[PDB]
């Protein structure tokens, strides 16, 4: 019934099938859908996830309008996500006024100082990361990167926010389809919101963080903060600092392997700023510009978010286009990062895109790997530091080459989340 | 899970059973529940319709705060009602900005002038109402009031808004449980919102009001007005002008019958202002004060709405009480109209409560038969005029006495909506 909203507004888009909308088109993944749609319809198009209208925009001013200018007023919240349960109070899932309070309460966790407090602490598990890697390198056995990176990433997040120290080769107490049917049956979300389909593992263990850091800064600031809400924020932070940190690290190492000129040119800078394999510090990391380039260029090819979303909470007319209340506005971050109308040879890995000679010819509303505006990635600065500190210690000791079973070229997960089809396996040699 | 919100806030209320909340207590009707709860817990209490917290308030300043002071900001919308379908666009069901536009677009329908245009037109079907009554009076047969009143009321609404003239003794083309399960399964509302469970009778007939009045004033003002939205507003107006007008008229005549001193004292005023059985006009109706008293006192005993409701759309602290977002605030209009801490002998029918000698000792936030603030009854003035014009022509010609089968004392419908258990049947004699 509601499948004529874009036929009405004169906005092009793929013809939706009843009930399904255009979800059958996701058979190649969200990214191949947005890339094709970006070609088919232009700067603006609209489709339907079930009965839910999605408006895709690609205009830098419209994107600046949505994510920044009209954030607090109209585009405060993301698509409703359920069933969540108590996790409705998580910052990334909370809406309107409740989200504003959580954003203020958790913002001072990633100040330039609180991050600088974390550099002496992060410098530990990188040496566990090297020593765990020196074992699988002295034996000529190819290495699953996400295993030893995730083992590292998990070690970082548990201490940077709480303080628990665990080598992630022994028992790691941290375990963690149908979401398609959720889009045809979003009416089933409130259904599952009563049968408590939301494990009690950390729901009582992290709840029993009696402690009698991020965990410190929460009870210290407790219209204040709750406790079951404190657990939910811990779950969000623990996931992000693990999966996002590890997945991107595998992405970077795959590119350094298939582009050995970029791997050596980066190794030459690390030994320069840090001679005699010096331990990386807060200020020596921010000095390395080629490392910043390699990180940014990998995030162009693999923005793990793929899409930025905002629910339009009332009728508006942004940049000369009427947008009705309830529409989910979408920024195809993946399709924008590979749009040839902005990037030269956009499928190629070229870190020189982000050189200070060329970093000005890049629109920060086309390149948006961390979002933008008041609801951008809250851990953007931390994640950049945690990854870079990891990249320094690893490349200071090991080089990386492709293996026989290394998937070249890498296929993206044609499924839901931005991951590789096959895991990233590379040979590791010792310098 | 959410059954501790009032246990937390220190707000008293009946202990909710899981899933059901306190809906089993509705076995005597909403009114006997609110009256008892008003006694048990005092100025403020809270219960649960399923999993849905309801906060009942009785404080005149708090009521003034909710319905008027913080209407546009926090208490804009009523409880979500579904499945509705296209009727989501009806003014009484629409929310926030969409409702503001509809309220402005439909407000000038009931100006003092547009109503005055309707007095010469309403004066027709009252004579059909008398002539239909003179037949069942010359025969000594008791009369079902709501039949001949509803036949009258329907005749008024179809012409006052569109223009169609029909004696309501021939075929009337206007026909019109589980809502309890809706409260335990409000998660099922979005479910039914896709299977179009919302007849096409006027959905295409009223949609085919080509006309090529309320209907006039809609296309004339067509960020403007739509057409399927035009149908929905017609359905709302047609129901209200029928059921509310007829039901209250039966209520008034029952009270005049069981209180013949009030019936004669009212008949004496009507013949005074309108001698020689003069036709009532706009200004002769507004002059009759005892008729205004009888109308108001009946609306005290039988406020057909029973309850006023507002969804609290964000955290607030009104009159020194914190109220969390999502709570449905409720004004027990029925229980307030019979509260002995404001009314003397509140079960007795005493029109002298509203005499200009005593109409000042009445708080207009305790007596709220039409709501209050920007979202009060939009047809308040019209309905008062339509009923009073009907009461004049009827009492000018007939007196009313109780019958053998007349339910004395009247039992209210222990069910959902404010109606009598048995229909109102009274003997009609000719003056
Ligand atoms: C390479 C690593 C990461 C990338 C590329 C990334 C990217 C993003 C993006 C694109 C968004 C959405 C922004 C928007 O919609 O405008 C986001 C949100 C968010 N990120 Fe990250 N992120 C990363 C790591 C992290 C880390 C380490 C944390 C640790 C706490 C984190 C916490 C969050 C939270 C809480 C949100 C939701 C913010 C809100 O709704 O207010 N992320 N991230
Ligand atoms: C004796 C007759 C009537 C009584 C006692 C009555 C009472 C009420 C009450 C108590 C409300 C809710 C106000 C609030 O929540 O604050 C309401 C709303 C409403 N009434 Fe009436 N009403 C009557 C007749 C009518 C008539 C004849 C119409 C014709 C159009 C009408 C149209 C409406 C509408 C559209 C609303 C919803 C207003 C909104 O949501 O903005 N009513 N009425
Ligand atoms: O994963 C989606 N997330 C949100 C809705 S809640 C989700 C809840 C969650 C918590 C923990 C683990 C998985 C899921 C969440 O809290 N995730 C951020 C936390 C980690 C993180 C990841 C990346 C960067 N930083 C931090 C929409 C979204 C759209 N675009 C985004 C971009 C970035 C972050 C979130 C979003 C999504 C999954 C499937 C279907 N629909 C939505
Ligand atoms: O009937 C409820 N109505 C609303 C929700 S939508 C309802 C939709 C409707 C339209 C037509 C016929 C029946 C129902 C509506 O449009 N009705 C006003 C129109 C007539 C009218 C009646 C009286 C006075 N004026 C005009 C809540 C409400 C709460 N208190 C009120 C007081 C007055 C009006 C509405 C409300 C209710 C029924 C069962 C369960 N929940 C809600």
UniProtKB/Swiss-Prot annotation, chains A, B:
Functional pathway: Steroid hormone biosynthesis; Cofactor metabolism; retinol metabolism; Steroid metabolism; cholesterol metabolism; Lipid metabolism; fatty acid metabolism
Subcellular location: Endoplasmic reticulum membrane; Microsome membrane
Statement: the UniProt record of this protein carries the keyword Heme: yes
Record keywords: Disease variant, Endoplasmic reticulum, Fatty acid metabolism, Heme, Iron, Lipid biosynthesis, Lipid metabolism, Membrane, Metal-binding, Microsome, Monooxygenase, Oxidoreductase, Steroid biosynthesis, Steroid metabolism, Sterol metabolism, Transmembrane, Transmembrane helix, Ubl conjugation
Resulting phenotype, residue 402 to S: In allele CYP3A4*19
GO BP, one annotated term: vitamin D catabolic process
Effect of residue 135 to Q: In allele CYP3A4*15
Subunit structure: Interacts with PGRMC1; the interaction requires PGRMC1 homodimerization.
Disease in which the protein is involved: Vitamin D-dependent rickets 3: An autosomal dominant disorder of vitamin D metabolism resulting in early-onset rickets, reduced serum levels of the vitamin D metabolites 25-hydroxyvitamin D and 1,25-dihydroxyvitamin D, and deficient responsiveness to parent and activated forms of vitamin D.
Protein name stated in the entry: Cytochrome P450 3A4
Species for this entry: Homo sapiens
């Amino acid at each position: 019934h509601s499948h004529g909203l874009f036929k009405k507004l004169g906005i092009p888009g793929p013809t939706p099938l009843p009930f399904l909308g255009n979800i059958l088109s996701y058979h190649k993944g969200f990214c191949m859908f947005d890339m094709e749609c970006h070609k088919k319809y232009g700067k603006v198009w609209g489709f339907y996830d079930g009965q839910q209208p999605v408006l895709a925009i690609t205009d830098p001013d419209m994107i600046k309008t949505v994510l920044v200018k009209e954030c607090y007023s109209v585009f405060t919240n993301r698509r409703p996500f359920g069933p969540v349960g108590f996790m409705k109070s998580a910052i990334s899932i909370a809406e309107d006024e409740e989200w504003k309070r959580l954003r203020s309460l958790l913002s001072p966790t990633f100040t330039s100082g609180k991050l600088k407090e974390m550099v002496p602490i992060i410098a530990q598990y990188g040496d566990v990361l090297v020593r765990n890697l020196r074992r699988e390198a002295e034996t000529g056995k190819p290495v699953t990167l996400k295993d030893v990176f995730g083992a590292y990433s998990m070690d970082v997040i548990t201490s940077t926010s709480f303080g628990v120290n665990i080598d992630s080769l022994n028992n790691p107490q941290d375990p963690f389809p149908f979401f398609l049917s959720i889009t045809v049956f979003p009416f089933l979300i409130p259904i599952l919101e009563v049968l408590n389909i939301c494990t009690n593992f950390l729901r009582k263990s992290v709840k029993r963080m009696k402690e009698s850091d991020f965990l410190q800064l929460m009870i210290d600031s407790q219209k204040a903060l709750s406790d079951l809400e404190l657990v939910a924020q811990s779950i969000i932070f623990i996931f992000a600092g693990y999966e996002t940190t590890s997945s991107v690290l595998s992405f970077i190492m795959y590119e350094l392997a298939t582009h050995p000129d970029v791997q050596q040119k980066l190794q030459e800078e690390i030994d320069a700023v840090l001679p005699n394999k010096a331990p990386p510090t807060y200020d020596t990391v921010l000095q390395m510009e080629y490392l910043d380039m390699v990180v940014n260029e990998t995030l162009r090819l693999f923005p793990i978010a793929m899409r930025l979303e905002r629910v339009c909470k009332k009728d508006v007319e942004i940049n000369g286009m009427f947008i009705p209340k309830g529409v989910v506005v979408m920024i195809p971050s993946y399709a924008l990062h590979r749009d040839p109308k902005y990037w030269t040879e956009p499928e190629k890995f070229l870190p020189e895109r982000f050189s200070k000679k060329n970093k000005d010819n890049i629109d920060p509303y086309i390149y948006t790997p961390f979002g933008s505006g008041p609801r951008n990635c809250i851990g953007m600065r931390f994640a950049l530091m945690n990854m870079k500190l990891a990249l320094i210690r690893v490349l200071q000791n090991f080089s990386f080459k492709p293996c026989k079973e290394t998937q070249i070229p890498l296929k993206l997960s044609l499924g839901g989340l931005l991951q590789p089809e096959k895991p990233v396996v590379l040979k590791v040699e010792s310098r």
